[PDB]
Amino acid sequence: DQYIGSIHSLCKDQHGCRFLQKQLDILGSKAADAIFEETKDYTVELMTDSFGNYLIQKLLEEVTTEQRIVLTKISSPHFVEISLNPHGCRALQKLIECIKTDEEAQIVVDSLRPYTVQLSKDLNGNHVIQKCLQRLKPENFQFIFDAISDSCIDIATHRHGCRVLQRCLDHGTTEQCDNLCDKLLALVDKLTLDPFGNYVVQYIITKEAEKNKYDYTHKIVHLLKPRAIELSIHKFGSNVIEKILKTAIVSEPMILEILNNGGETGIQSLLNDSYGNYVLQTALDISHKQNDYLYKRLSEIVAPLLVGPIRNTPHGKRIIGMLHL
């Protein structure tokens, strides 16, 4: 039954600022009504605060629906300056973790919508667009899927915007995830080579093979394989190709591409180059385990090219370990 207003100005410490929280941990069924009707005026710069967001974060766990909606309405006109902030994003993230109504949600989506692309590129913005994916219903977060679908290639090829795409494939709809993948698959040339998008391509495959249910993986391979050698020596592509190798339902046809079309030449290229090198080692490693004979047929066009300085290098030393297993 304690005391003290003035709460507000405790919000400048980290101590009297971690105190208001000490106060609600052991409370505040009726105390977070106080704090509320007080701080409800500084919520925006409390959110963007180095210690203020903490109180806020916890304050929305404790507060009532009516009170959470009020805050949402107070912060809606500023979600952008909030999203782009180190602490703000973490307060705003929690906000979304708590929204329990198809109004709270329906308010956030109008506020975030005009700025979806923008916000997913931001170092701090993505983690909030990402959280809309995690916590919101699919009918709700639809706006994101549409925002992205439009700027498919730059969100896909973007330090930050790409992680968003992955998180869509993690939480979207078989309908949603599909129209997106039809947009992504039309650029898998550019996407496999890119330093970021080549992670997206791998994800598709990563995710289907969680489901054990393959639709795009095949379509991806059908488009790629023809250019197997070329991509195995490419700095980024060589990682997509290694993915396919590691993906059981596609290994063999890919290994067969290298044998068939990677000539005895194409395998020379794999041997000497800084990227192909690893492809070739993955090929040997798998086929050994995967296919009695493919290993053999391949492990024999290798054996004879391992002469000279090559036997010395880091990569040659490793390649030979593969050969008699």
Residue 1 Cβ vs RNA, minimum distance, rounded to whole Å: 25
Residue 31 backbone phi and psi in degrees, to 5? -90, -35
Residue 195 Cβ vs RNA, minimum distance, rounded to whole Å: 5
Residue 161 Cβ vs RNA, minimum distance, rounded to whole Å: 9
Applying CB under 7 A, which residues contact RNA? 14, 17-18, 21, 50-51, 53-54, 57, 86-87, 89-91, 93, 123-124, 126-127, 130, 159-160, 162-163, 166-167, 195-196, 198-199, 202, 235-236, 238-239, 242, 274-275, 277-279, 281, 314-315, 318
b/e 255-286 (16+ beta carbons within 10 angstroms → b):
bbbbbeebeeebbebbbebebbbbbbbbbbbb
Cβ distance to RNA smaller for residue 68 or 163 = 163
Q: Which residue in 152, 93, 76 sits closest to 144, CA to CA?
A: 152
Q: Which residue in 248, 259, 195 sits closest to 221, CA to CA?
A: 248
Cβ distance to RNA smaller for residue 50 or 106 = 50
Q: Which amino acid is it at 31?
A: A
Cβ distance to RNA smaller for residue 68 or 160 = 160
N-to-C CA span, the chain: 75
Spatial distance between the Cα atoms of 298 and 292, rounded to a whole number of angstroms: 11
Cβ distance to RNA smaller for residue 57 or 67 = 57
Residue 88 Cβ vs RNA, minimum distance, rounded to whole Å: 8
Q: Are 108 and 99 in contact (CB under 8 A)?
A: yes
Cβ distance to RNA smaller for residue 36 or 196 = 196
Residue 67 Cβ vs RNA, minimum distance, rounded to whole Å: 21
